[model samples]
Target: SKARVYADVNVLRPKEYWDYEALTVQWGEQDDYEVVRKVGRGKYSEVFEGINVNNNEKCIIKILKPVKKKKIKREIKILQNLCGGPNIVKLLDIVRDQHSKTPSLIFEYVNNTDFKVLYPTLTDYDIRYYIYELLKALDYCHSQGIMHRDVKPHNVMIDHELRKLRLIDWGLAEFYHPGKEYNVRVASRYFKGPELLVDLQDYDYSLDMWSLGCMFAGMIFRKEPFFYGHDNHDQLVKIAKVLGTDGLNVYLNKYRIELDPQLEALVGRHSRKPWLKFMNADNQHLVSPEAIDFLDKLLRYDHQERLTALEAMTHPYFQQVRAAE
Candidate 1:
């Protein structure tokens, strides 16, 4: 018999009725806002369209459900630290209702679509333009000692005009200082950098570059995901399919990640053919040459060799516009 999967109606309820009343109360009071519509729901929070009563401005309110005290505190701390940025979503206020006692964050409402929904319909020029905006935002975030950790299209939003890109969802973001040590495995499965895949205990900001590369590839080729896999092994197999087993090893070795027997067995040793088969031959000229060049740097399996956001922005693909600006 086939196993039946049932949707849990309990999960669909509003955050206000959840067990985490304290956190919800905290959100309502902090912003002094009125909830308009429930916009989204996640594993740990419910996001609502809210209006700031004082200013009468529309905002998005994210209420964190009751969970470990440390997790909630960490999210709030990161949001507070990330304030005052134009490229990033602005955190307007924090609220808490007395009855619920749960805390919520009020953010400037971006009344536009997410990149995931908009990218497929974009023209080549639009893709390049959007990438430029994304890089600009990434540059600012990196300069501010913050690592977005997650850089997928779903987490990026456009403005009312659908021209500007704003990075949102800092749930997995982490603060990194040069020469400091932190142990946190962040980023999605497809976008995970080689350093994270190789299990490096200490690394830098290059992880985001790898994700950007994957993202750029998807946009240019209209591919689903360059690294679609259910797990790390599956991801490696997909990489090997594109770059060959030897190419994969060469990429990994360039970053100084020594392969163990287990890794070698799964990734294999024989080199395969190049990735020309997977490329959309007809669309080659549609993409920016600079974008392709930068994409190469961004997609390198070696973290040390990966392109930085600044470097990508300066690539020849963006040279004219970058120079003019």
Candidate 2:
């Protein structure tokens, strides 16, 4: 099984943490939090902006949709484990609806401006700064032996005015134990990595790097989805169109991975596309040798070819951010 940069195996730790399912959850009183408005919604959960009745502090209330009991348990465990880590969305409370038996997670609020409104107005420094903050969360979670299977622009909450970013949405996040095969059906389609697209289940933390790379490419290239694909089958082709099909063969052959006929038909000789080709008058301000080089290293077809969160944090693209610190 292929391992990642931070694959110190934590085999039973997940079960120990997830053992919260067997014990009482210490559910807080639901009356303590008041929902302000609907903020976001997901297949597994409904999110809301909320306020604490006692202290009047703003927070996020993630009301889990009707799901398996173990799912809610795993999310709560991961959040609790990563609590107080750098840039982690703070878990404030675990409450439940007494009548409906519905569960909710409370988090410290972020005064996040919409990415559509914020990404364009951001200066080059803003991109570097937020990315550096993002790496902190990624590194922290990876170091804690968790792969945030869902990593995307929507999952990253940025309070740009405060220069703060919190990596939220732990629903799909899973504990990483060495040599374990996981479901390939994790991350969002657009942000999904090559391993997922090619049906590789033995992926690791580096999967998150691919997702981050997709988001980073969008931020700097002025594209909403750097690898925009209409469907899962088209998604790999979209990536191959840019990253090329040849490296994919190398990766697949190296891993002894066989592609389905539908996907195999799409694979052929393709030269790696240059990142500089994406630059233009509109986004030239954010393009540089460092930025292009960093993106090139990240958007690789092979999971191992991508840089780890910690390694990416040290790349020249983020030199300015670290220097500022």
Candidate 3:
């Protein structure tokens, strides 16, 4: 289905803007950056803290694993396209090894506090402020016709001391084209939208909104993953358990998607769980009526019904954050 907003963004732009495969690499000298320590490892890449020997500046070195050249180009192109967008991680340089041609992406360093250690310590205002900052990045990317298929906390870097946030990892991001059937195998399990779980390939920017809703819910509820699922099939079951099977049926009918009988039986029947039922003494301060209202607009079964990034920023839940700005 076409996005309710910005559906024609790529349509209006020149092909080069969305044609990432055609991108050419202008590789930087690998010798200029030296790895300091291993920071993270993912299925697709290894991350390291590094130093730019030239100016002694700290940076991030993301050494990608062996993958298709086309995939490499897409990440680089999307990064360059979104370089200075609000709260977007800055891609400083692209370097490669002379012998093996092992490509490494260099980024401006962020003194990020780990989410597990940081989220619990945040004041209610801090959550509101950082979320607003993240929305700025999301809105900018969506306006540029790109969707960040992955939007989990791990990909969002926060420097609590400086109160800065960066939406990192554009590896899974893609340019959004109306009615294009995208791969449903994108977001991480817990953050996966109902569209992806149901194999809705024509999903649009609203997909990220669902991921954002999952994240927001986790933060407010003090659950690291608000929806914990063991597998793809179980992910839908977890969502249905909360949002109810009736809405799932409506979403399935609207999309004309038929689940396999085995999976259908697994989902069974479930009544809606009220959002307030998740509130507890620990998270009560973070759970406000405005917060619940804002989240309801985001975690909808219908992708079209989800709030656009721009619309989400204007929600009353961020009123204090907006006023401070």
Question: What is the C-alpha lDDT profile of model 3 across 188-232, one tens digit per residue?
Answer: 999999999888899999999999999999999998799999999
lDDT sort, best first: 3, 2, 1
lDDT scores of the candidates, listed in order? 0.68, 0.88, 0.93
| Model 2 C-alpha lDDT per residue in residues 1-325, reported as the tens digit of each score | 6656667746535467645466457899899999999999888889999999999989999999999887788888889989999999999999999999999999999768778888999899888889899999999999888899999888988888787889999999998877889999999999999999988888999999999999999999999988889888889988988877788888889989998987778755678788888999999999978888898888887888889898999998888789889
TM for every model, in the order presented, reads 0.81, 0.96, 0.98
The C-alpha stretches of model 2 lying farther than 4 A from their native spots are: 9-15, 18-23
* lDDT, residue 177, model 3: 91
Clashing pairs in 3: none
Model 1, position 224: C-alpha lDDT score: 58
Residue pairs in clash, model 2:
none
RMSD of each: 10.5, 1.6, 0.8
Candidates 1 and 3, the one with greater lDDT? 3
